[PDB]
Tab-separated table of C-alpha atoms in Angstrom:
chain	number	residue	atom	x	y	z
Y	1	UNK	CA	1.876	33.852	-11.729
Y	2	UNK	CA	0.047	30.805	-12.280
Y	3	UNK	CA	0.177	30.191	-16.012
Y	4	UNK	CA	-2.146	27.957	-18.335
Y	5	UNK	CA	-2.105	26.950	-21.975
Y	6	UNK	CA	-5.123	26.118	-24.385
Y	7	UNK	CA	-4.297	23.501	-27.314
Y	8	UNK	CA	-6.651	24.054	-29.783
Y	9	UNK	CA	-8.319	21.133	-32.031
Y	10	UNK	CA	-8.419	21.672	-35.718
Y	11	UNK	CA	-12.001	22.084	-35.663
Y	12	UNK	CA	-11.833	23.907	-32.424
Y	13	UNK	CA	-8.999	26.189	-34.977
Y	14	UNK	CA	-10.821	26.406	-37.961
Y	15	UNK	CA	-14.734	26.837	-36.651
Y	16	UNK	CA	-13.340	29.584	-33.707
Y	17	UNK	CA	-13.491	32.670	-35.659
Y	18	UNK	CA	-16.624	32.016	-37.342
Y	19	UNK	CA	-18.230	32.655	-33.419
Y	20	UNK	CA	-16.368	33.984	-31.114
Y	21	UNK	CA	-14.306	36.929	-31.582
Y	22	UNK	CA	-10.374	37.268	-30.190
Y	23	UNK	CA	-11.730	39.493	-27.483
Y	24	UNK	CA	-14.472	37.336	-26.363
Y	25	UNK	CA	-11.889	33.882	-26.561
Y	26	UNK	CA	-9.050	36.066	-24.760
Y	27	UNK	CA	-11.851	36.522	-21.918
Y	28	UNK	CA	-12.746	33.054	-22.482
Y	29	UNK	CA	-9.458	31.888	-21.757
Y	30	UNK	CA	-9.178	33.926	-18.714
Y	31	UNK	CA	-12.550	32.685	-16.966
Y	32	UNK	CA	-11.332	28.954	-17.847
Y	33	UNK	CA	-8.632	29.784	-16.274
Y	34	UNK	CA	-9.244	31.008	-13.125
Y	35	UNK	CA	-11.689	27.901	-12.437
Y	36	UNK	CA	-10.528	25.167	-14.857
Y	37	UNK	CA	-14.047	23.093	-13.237
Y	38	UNK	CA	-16.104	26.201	-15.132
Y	39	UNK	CA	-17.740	24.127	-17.099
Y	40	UNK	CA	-19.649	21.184	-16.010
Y	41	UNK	CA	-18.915	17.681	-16.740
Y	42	UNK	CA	-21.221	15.590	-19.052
Y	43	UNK	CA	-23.063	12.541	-17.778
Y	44	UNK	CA	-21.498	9.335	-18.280
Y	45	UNK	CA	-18.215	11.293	-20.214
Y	46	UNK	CA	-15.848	10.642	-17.295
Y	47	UNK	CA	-14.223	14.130	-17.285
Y	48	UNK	CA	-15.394	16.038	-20.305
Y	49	UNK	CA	-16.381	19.273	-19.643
Y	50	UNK	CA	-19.061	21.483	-21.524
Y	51	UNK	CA	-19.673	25.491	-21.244
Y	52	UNK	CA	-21.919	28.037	-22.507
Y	53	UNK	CA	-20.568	31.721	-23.329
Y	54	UNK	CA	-22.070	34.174	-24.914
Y	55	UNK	CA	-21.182	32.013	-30.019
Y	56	UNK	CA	-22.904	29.385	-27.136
Y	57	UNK	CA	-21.634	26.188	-26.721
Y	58	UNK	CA	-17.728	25.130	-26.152
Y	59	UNK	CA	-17.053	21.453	-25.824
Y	60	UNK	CA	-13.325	21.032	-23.444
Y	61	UNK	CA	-11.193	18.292	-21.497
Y	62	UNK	CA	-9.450	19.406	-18.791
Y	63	UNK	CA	-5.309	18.050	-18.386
Y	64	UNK	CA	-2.965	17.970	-15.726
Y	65	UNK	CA	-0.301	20.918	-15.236
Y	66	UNK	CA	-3.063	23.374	-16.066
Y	67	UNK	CA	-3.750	22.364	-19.662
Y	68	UNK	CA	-6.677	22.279	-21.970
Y	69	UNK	CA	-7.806	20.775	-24.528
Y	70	UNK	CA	-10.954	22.940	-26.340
Y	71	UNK	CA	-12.474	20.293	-28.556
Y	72	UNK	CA	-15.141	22.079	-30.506
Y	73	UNK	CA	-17.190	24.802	-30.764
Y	74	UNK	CA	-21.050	26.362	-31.780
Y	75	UNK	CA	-24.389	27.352	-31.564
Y	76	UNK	CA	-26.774	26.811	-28.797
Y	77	UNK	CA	-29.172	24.954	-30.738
Y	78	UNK	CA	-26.408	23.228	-33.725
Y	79	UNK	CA	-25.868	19.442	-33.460
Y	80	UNK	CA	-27.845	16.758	-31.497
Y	81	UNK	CA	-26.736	15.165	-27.865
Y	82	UNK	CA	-24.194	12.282	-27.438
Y	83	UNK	CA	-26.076	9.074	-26.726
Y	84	UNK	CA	-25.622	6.934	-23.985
Y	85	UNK	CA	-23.508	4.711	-26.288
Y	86	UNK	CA	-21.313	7.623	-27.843
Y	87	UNK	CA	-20.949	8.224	-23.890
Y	88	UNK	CA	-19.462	5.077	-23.339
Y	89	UNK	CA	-17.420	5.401	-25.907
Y	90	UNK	CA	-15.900	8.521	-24.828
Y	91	UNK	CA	-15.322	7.437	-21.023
Y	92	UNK	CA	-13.781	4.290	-22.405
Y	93	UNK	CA	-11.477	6.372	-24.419
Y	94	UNK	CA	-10.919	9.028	-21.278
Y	95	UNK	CA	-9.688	5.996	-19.233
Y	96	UNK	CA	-6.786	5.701	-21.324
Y	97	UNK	CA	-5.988	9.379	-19.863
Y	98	UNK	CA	-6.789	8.348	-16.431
Y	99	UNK	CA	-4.977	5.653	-16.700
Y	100	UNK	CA	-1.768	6.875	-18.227
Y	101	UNK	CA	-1.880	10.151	-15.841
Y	102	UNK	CA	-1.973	7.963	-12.509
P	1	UNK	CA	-21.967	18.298	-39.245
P	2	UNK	CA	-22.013	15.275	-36.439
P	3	UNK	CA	-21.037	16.001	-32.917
P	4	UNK	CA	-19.597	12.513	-32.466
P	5	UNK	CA	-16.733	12.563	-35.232
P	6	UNK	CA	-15.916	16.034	-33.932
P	7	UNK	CA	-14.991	14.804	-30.665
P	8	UNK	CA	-13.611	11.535	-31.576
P	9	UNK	CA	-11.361	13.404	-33.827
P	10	UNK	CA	-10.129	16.264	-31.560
P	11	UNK	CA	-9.807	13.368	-28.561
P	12	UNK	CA	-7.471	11.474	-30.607
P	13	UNK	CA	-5.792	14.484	-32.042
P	14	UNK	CA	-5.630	15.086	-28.593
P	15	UNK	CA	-4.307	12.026	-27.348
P	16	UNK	CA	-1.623	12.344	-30.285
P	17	UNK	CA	-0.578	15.677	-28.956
P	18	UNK	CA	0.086	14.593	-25.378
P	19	UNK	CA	1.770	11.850	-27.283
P	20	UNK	CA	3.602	14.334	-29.116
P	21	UNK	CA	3.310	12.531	-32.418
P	22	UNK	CA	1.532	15.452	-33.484
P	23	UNK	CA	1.180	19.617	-33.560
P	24	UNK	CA	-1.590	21.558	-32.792
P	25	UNK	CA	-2.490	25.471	-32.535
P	26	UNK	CA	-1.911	26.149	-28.913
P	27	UNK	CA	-2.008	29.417	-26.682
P	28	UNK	CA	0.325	30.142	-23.765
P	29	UNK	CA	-1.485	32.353	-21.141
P	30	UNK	CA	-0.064	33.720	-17.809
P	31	UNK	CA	-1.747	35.931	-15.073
P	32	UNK	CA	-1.392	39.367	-14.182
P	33	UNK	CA	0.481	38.397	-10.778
P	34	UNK	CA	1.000	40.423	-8.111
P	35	UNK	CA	2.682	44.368	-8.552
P	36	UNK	CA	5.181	45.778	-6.283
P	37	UNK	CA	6.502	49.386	-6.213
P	38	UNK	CA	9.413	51.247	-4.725
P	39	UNK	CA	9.168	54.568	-2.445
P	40	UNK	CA	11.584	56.401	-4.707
P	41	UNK	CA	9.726	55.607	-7.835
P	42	UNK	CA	6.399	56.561	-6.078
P	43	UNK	CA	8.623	60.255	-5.316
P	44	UNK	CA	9.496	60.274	-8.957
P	45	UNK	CA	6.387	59.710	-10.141
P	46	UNK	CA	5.192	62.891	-7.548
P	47	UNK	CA	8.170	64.917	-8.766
P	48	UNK	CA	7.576	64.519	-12.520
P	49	UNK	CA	3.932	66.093	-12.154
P	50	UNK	CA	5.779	68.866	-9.607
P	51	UNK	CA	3.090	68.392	-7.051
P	52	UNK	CA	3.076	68.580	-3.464
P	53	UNK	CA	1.966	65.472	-1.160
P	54	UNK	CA	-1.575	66.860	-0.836
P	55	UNK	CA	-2.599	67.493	-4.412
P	56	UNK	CA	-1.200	64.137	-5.356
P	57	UNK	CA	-2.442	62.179	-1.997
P	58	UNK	CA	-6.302	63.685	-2.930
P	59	UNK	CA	-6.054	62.603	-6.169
P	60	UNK	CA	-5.026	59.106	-5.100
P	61	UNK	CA	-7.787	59.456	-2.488
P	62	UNK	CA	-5.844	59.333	0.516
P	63	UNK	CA	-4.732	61.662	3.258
P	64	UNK	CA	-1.022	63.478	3.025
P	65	UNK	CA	0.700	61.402	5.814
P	66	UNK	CA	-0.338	58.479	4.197
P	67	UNK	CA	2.055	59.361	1.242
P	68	UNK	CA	4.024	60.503	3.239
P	69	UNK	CA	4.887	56.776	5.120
P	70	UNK	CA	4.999	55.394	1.498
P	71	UNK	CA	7.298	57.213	-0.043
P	72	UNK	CA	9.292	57.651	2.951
P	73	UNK	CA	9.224	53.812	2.853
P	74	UNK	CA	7.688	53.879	6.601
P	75	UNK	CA	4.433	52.117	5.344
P	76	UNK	CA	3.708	49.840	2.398
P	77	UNK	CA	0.028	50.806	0.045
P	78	UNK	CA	-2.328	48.351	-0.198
P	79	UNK	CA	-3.317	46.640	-3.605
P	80	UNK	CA	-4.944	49.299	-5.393
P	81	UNK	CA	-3.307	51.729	-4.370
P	82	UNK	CA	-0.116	50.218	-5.949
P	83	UNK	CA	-2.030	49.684	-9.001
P	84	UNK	CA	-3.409	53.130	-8.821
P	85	UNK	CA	-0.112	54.488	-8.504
P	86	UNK	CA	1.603	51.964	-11.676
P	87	UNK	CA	-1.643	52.836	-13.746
P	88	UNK	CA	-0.323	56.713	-13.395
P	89	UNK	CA	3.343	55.607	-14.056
P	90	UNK	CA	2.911	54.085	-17.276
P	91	UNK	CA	-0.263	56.340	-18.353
P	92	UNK	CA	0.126	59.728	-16.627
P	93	UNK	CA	-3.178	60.814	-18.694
P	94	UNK	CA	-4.631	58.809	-16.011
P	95	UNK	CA	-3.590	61.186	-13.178
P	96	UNK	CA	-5.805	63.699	-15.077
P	97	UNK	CA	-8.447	61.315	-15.784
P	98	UNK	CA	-8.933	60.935	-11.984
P	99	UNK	CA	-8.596	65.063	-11.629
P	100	UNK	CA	-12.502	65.338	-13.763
P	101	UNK	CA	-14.016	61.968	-12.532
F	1	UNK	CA	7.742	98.989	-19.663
F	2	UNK	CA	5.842	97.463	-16.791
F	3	UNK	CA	5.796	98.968	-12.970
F	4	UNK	CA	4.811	96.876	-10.179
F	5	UNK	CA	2.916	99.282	-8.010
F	6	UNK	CA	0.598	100.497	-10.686
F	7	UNK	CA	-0.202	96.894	-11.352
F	8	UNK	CA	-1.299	95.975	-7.888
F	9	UNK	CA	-2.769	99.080	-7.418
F	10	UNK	CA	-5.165	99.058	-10.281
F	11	UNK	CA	-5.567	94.907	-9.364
F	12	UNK	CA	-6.950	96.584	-5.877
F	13	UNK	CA	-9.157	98.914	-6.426
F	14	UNK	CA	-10.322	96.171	-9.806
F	15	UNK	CA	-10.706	93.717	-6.588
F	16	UNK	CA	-12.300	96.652	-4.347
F	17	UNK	CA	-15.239	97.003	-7.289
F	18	UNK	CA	-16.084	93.382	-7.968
F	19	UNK	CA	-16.437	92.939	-4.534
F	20	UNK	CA	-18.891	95.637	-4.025
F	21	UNK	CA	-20.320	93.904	-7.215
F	22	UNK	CA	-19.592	96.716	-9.454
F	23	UNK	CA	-17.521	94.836	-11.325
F	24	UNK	CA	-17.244	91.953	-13.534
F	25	UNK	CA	-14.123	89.516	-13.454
F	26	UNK	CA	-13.244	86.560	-15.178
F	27	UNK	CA	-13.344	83.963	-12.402
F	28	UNK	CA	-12.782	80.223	-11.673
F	29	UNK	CA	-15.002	78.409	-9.727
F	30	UNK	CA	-13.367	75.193	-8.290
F	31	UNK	CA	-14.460	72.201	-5.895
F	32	UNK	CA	-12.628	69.499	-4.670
F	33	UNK	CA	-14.119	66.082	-4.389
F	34	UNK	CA	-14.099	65.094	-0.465
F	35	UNK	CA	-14.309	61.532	-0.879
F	36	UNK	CA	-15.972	59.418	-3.908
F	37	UNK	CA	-18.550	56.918	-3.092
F	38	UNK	CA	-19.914	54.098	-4.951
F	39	UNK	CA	-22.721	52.114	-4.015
F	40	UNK	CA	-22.626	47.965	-4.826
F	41	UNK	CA	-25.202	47.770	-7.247
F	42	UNK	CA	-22.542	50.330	-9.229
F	43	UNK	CA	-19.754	47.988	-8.749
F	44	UNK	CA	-22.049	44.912	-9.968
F	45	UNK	CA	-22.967	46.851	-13.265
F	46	UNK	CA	-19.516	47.918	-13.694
F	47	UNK	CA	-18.517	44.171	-13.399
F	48	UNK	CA	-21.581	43.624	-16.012
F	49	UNK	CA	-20.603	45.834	-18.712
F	50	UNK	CA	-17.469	44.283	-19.365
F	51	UNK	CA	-19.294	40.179	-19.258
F	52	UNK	CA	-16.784	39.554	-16.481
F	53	UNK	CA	-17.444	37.359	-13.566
F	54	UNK	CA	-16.330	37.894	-10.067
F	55	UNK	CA	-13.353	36.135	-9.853
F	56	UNK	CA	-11.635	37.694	-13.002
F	57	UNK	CA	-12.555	41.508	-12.197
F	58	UNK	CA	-11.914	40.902	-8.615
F	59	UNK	CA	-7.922	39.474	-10.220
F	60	UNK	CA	-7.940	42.573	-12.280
F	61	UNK	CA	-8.686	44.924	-9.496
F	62	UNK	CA	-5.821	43.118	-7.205
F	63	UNK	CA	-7.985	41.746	-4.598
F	64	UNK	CA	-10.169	38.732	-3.625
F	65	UNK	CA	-13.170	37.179	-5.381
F	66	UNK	CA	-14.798	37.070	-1.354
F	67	UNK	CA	-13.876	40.747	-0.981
F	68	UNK	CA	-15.380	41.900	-3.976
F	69	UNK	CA	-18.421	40.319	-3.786
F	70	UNK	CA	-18.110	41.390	0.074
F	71	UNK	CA	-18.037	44.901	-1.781
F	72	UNK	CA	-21.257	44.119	-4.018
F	73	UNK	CA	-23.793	42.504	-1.191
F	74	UNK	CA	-22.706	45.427	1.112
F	75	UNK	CA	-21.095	43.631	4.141
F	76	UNK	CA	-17.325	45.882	3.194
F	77	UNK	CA	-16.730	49.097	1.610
F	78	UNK	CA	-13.985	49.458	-0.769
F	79	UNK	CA	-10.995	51.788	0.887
F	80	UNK	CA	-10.103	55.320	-1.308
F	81	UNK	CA	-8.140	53.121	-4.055
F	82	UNK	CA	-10.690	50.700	-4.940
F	83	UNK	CA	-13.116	53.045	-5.500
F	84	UNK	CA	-10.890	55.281	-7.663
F	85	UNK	CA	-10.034	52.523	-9.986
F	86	UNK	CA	-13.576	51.044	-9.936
F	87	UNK	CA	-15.161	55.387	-11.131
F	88	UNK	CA	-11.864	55.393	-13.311
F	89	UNK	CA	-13.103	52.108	-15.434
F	90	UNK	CA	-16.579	53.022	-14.886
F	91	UNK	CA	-16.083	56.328	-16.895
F	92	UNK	CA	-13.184	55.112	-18.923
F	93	UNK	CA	-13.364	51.360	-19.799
F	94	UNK	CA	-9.817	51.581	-21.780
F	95	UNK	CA	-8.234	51.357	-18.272
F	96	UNK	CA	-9.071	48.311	-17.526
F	97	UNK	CA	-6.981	46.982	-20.191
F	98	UNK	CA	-4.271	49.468	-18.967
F	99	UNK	CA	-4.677	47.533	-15.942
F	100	UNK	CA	-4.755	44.596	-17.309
F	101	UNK	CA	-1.410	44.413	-19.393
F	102	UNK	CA	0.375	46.159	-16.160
X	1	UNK	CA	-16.113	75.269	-2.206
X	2	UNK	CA	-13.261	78.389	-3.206
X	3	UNK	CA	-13.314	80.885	-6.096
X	4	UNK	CA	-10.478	82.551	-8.550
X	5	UNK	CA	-10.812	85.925	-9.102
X	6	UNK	CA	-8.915	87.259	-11.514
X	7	UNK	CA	-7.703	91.229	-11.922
X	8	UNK	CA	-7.336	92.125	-15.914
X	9	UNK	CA	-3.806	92.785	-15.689
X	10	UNK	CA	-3.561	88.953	-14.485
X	11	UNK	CA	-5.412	87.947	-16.906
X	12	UNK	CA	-3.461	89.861	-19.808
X	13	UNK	CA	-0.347	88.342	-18.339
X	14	UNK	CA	-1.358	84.775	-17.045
X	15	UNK	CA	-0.838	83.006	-20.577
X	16	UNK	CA	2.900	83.987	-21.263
X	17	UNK	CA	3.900	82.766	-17.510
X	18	UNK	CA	1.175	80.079	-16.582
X	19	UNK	CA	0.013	77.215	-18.976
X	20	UNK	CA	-3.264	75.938	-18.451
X	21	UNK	CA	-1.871	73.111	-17.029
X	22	UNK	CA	0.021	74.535	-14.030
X	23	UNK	CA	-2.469	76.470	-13.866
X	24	UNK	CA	-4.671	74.569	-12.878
X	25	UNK	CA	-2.098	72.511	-10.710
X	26	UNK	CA	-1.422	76.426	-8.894
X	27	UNK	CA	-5.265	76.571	-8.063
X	28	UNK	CA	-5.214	72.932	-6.605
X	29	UNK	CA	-2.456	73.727	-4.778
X	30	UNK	CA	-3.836	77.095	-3.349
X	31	UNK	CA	-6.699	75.551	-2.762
X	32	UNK	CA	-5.242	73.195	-0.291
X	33	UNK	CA	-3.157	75.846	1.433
X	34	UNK	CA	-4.362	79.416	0.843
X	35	UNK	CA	-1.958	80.808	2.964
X	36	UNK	CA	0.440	79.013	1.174
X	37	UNK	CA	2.386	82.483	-0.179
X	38	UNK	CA	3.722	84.492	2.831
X	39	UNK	CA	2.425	88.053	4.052
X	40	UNK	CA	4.474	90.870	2.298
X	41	UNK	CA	5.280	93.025	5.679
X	42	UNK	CA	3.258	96.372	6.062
X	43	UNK	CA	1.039	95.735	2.852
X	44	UNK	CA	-1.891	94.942	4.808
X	45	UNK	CA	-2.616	91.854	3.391
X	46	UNK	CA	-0.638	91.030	0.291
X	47	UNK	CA	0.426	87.170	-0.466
X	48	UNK	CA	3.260	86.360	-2.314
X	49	UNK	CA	3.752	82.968	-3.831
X	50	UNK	CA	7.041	81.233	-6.382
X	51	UNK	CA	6.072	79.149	-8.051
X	52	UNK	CA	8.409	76.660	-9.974
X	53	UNK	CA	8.667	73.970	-13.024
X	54	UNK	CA	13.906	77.177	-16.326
X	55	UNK	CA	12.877	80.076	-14.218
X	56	UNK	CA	10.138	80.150	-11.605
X	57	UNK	CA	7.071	82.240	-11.563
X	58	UNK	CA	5.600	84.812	-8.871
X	59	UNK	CA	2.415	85.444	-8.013
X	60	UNK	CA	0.831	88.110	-5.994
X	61	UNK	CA	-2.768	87.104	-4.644
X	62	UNK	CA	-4.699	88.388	-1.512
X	63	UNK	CA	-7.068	86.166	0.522
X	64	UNK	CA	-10.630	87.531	0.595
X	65	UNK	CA	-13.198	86.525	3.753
X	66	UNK	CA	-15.687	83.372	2.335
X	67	UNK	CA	-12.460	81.632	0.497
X	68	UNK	CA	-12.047	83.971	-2.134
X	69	UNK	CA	-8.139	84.576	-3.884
X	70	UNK	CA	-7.915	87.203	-5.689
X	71	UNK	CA	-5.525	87.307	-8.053
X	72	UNK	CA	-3.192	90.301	-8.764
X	73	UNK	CA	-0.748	90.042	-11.194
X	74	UNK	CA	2.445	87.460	-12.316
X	75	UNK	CA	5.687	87.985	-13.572
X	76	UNK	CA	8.926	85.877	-13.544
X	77	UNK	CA	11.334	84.981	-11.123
X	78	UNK	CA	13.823	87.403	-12.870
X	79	UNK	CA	11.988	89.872	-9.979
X	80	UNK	CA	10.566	93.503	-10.661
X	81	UNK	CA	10.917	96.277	-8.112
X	82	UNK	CA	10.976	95.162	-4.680
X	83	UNK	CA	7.882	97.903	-3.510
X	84	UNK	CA	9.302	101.068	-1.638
X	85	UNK	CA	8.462	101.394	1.696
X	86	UNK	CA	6.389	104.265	0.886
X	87	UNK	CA	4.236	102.000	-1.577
X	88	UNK	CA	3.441	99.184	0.824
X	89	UNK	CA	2.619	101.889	3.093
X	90	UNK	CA	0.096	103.489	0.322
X	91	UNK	CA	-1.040	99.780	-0.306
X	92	UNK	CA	-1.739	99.223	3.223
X	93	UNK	CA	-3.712	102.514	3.496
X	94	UNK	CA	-5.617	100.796	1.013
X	95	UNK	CA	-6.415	97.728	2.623
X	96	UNK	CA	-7.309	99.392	5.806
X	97	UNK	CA	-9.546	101.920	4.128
X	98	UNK	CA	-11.295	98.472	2.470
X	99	UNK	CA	-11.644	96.949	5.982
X	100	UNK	CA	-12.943	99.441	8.055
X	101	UNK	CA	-15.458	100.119	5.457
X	102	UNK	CA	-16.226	95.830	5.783
């Protein structure tokens, strides 16, 4: 058994039944977790991870021991892209993670 | 609705949680592993339908002496045949299911 | 109140006259499946209908994602089993949670 | 392909000693082996098969040419007359006369 655990965000918790259904998420958390790389990484992030399932777009970081962090969630057309300098930002911030997992 | 404060927020809730300064709703998910099943219960499992080896080896799709090494612990069935076979345990509407596919 | 050789008697000459087609007796007609056969494009629809990708059906069905798809593009063919579980969900979807909570 | 044939008396009777359900497990199983109920010496022909689950069952069928049973009569394993010798000979008589005749 290789087991895996999904922490949930409060917006990620409060904005999940408005789109996907516990059916759908159950499924979702199976195909993350077969192949926790699923979803592709986002330019200049340094390790967050993005995925669309169709109820599109699901915004996750990916942990050590099999853990992950889902983020938020929406539409495929709902909120604008991260900017280079939001990007920055949020690599900065990941290499806190990086660092403190090494 | 801004993307930006979303994931700020949950990153730092986030980075609180693998702190463990703070709760959040998580889900604890395992896989289906692997299945094993004994000989006898594979006999037991014939017996409480009262069917011979053939009836029950053509409904599992496979030939007499073939049952015959499993149960008789001689031979060991392959993966879906053991999940065949625990699918009819638990569900034994199944084992008609399979009679009128 | 009942007699045995009356009973096979009249079940005799009753048999004697529907085979001469004089007759008419309630009868069951029954054929046994030889073998089932399923072709891959059935096994990638069956996949399909439930939004499941390789990997996860092919973990549900016990086996590997490369023999599955091995399965699908034609290059294996599923043994007696496989293809039993594969009609079984195919006909009745229910199963596959049957299968999956094992 | 095989085909049940089935007299009126067996018919009339089937219900009370047969459900549906072994039944149809006693046709699978005949179908596999037909010879499956042994020859009943000096009646030309005439299969008898137990069949079991409380008390068993027995059957009395005869084999037709082109993989036709037809079906005599049932009763319970509490047994009725064993046939005279004089019967089986009468019911062989029978059976001849039906052959010869082809």
């Amino acid at each position: 058994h290789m087991k895996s655990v999904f922490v949930e965000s409060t917006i990620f918790e409060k904005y999940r039944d408005e789109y996907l259904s516990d059916e759908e998420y159950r499924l979702f958390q199976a195909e993350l977790m077969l192949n926790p790389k699923l979803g592709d990484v986002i330019q200049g992030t340094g390790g967050l991870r993005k995925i669309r399932v169709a109820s599109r777009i699901i915004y996750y970081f990916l942990d050590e021991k099999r853990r992950f962090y889902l983020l938020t969630i929406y539409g495929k057309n709902e909120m604008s892209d991260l900017n280079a300098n939001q990007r920055k930002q949020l690599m900065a911030f990941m290499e806190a993670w990086r660092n403190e997992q090494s | 609705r801004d993307l930006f404060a979303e994931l700020s927020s949950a990153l730092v809730e986030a980075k609180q949680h693998s702190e463990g300064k703070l709760t959040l709703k998580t889900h604890h998910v395992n896989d289906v592993g692997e299945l094993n099943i004994s000989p006898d219960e594979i006999v037991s499992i014939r017996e409480q339908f009262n069917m011979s080896r053939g009836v029950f080896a053509r409904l599992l799709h496979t030939s007499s002496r073939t049952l015959e090494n499993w149960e008789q612990g001689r031979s060991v069935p392959n993966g879906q045949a053991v999940t065949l076979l625990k699918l009819v345990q638990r569900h034994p509407e199944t084992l008609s299911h399979i009679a009128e596919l």
